[PDB]
């Protein structure tokens, strides 16, 4: 397929239809309409690897939403990318002030 011939796996045609419906431009760039899908695929691979690592850390086979929470929050670059958006049933990294301790 087009993704297979490109080495991709995300459905490019669905995104093409979405962009055509969104009418962000009359004639969208058809030289590489799956490129915007390729960058999203790279970001998704990053976040999925981090989530899988976080889930593996606490001996849980399945991706806990909290596991994804610390996976995204730990990375400073990820926090800069997406920091104004919260995640349902997420959490907060344990941050206790050293001078607060007795």
């Amino acid at each position: 397929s087009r993704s297979a011939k490109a080495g991709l796996t995300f459905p490019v045609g669905r995104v093409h239809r979405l962009l055509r419906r969104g009418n962000y431009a009359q004639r969208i760039g058809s030289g590489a309409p799956v490129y915007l899908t390729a960058v999203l695929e790279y970001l998704a691979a990053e976040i999925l690897e981090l989530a899988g690592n976080a889930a593996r850390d606490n001996k849980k086979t399945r991706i806990i939403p909290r596991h994804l929470q610390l996976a995204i929050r730990n990375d400073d670059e990820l926090n800069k990318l997406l920091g104004n958006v919260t995640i349902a049933q997420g959490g907060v990294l344990p941050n206790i002030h050293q001078n607060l301790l007795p």
């Binding site: 919260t86 002030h97 001078n99 607060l100 007795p102």
Partner: protein, 97 residues
């Protein structure tokens, strides 16, 4: 008497919460508050429980972010007890309103 000094269990209990991720607000009083604040506009609103759950999560997240920010603003000063000054300063600094 197994009484510990003020704050001895506080750090432990803070660790207990910041480990946890559950709903910190009882659902029924939150429903009461939502209905009270929403009936002032139109009747037969027909709220869907998923919606109230969504705003519940939103408000708790906003409040914990606020509270950590005011904790930082208070630990600025030689203070470990929070007073209205820190809350007002945190609200005004970001220009929420």
């Amino acid at each position: 008497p197994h009484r510990y000094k003020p704050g001895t269990v506080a750090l432990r209990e803070i660790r207990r919460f910041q480990k946890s991720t559950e709903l910190l607000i009882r659902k029924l009083p939150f429903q009461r508050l939502v209905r009270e604040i929403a009936q002032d506009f139109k009747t037969d609103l027909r709220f869907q429980s998923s919606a109230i759950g969504a705003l519940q999560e939103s408000v708790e997240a906003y409040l914990v972010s606020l509270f950590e920010d005011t904790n930082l603003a208070a630990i600025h000063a030689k203070r470990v007890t929070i007073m209205p000054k820190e809350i007002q300063l945190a609200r005004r600094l970001r220009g929420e309103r």
